[PDB]
């Protein structure tokens, strides 16, 4: 008397959580699901509206809350005084971000090692860190190339400090010259206490 479709009701929840997929056993009524979701609250919603059909026996979850790995992430980087200007972030289910700033490549490679040792999602991981000595070397670079040998910088977490001495006349250049060093990636900030010689 037409058995109820099985495979339409399956696919009318499914398709609302992206990342996700299935199998059903109609010998013995078990639905699998595996993928991703933003968070616990979005695996709840799913698990319920699957578990709401008529032919389902059983549901077998192997579904990733993202967010709890994340934060999880978080705290692990805390840990290391060498991380401490790094965390991740999940803008879309089954995609990570990492970001932030390290002081040196030494700091930068243990980083890595720790991901590949104890991050189970690599694969889903976008890494977006910025070097500071890295940055640092390239703004005293392109000062003095620039003709300004007695100004000096440091960097550190997205900001620059410019002090040292120029020479009145070349105030407007000077300003150009700190527009090119902003178009290194992880230039958040700068700060100039350049006097000028009369």
Sequence with gaps: IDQIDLIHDIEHVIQQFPTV??????????????????????????????????????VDDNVIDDEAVWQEMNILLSKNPEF??????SPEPGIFVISGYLKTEEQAACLADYLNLHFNYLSLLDNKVIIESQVMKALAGHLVQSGFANVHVSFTNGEAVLTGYINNKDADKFRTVVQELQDIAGIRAVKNFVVLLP
């Design 21 to 58: 997929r299935f199998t059903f056993n109609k010998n013995n009524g078990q639905l699998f699901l595996i993928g991703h979701v933003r968070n616990s609250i979005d695996k709840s919603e799913l698990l319920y509206k699957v578990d709401a059909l008529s032919f389902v026996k059983s």
């Design 84 to 89: 401490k200007g790094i965390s991740m972030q």
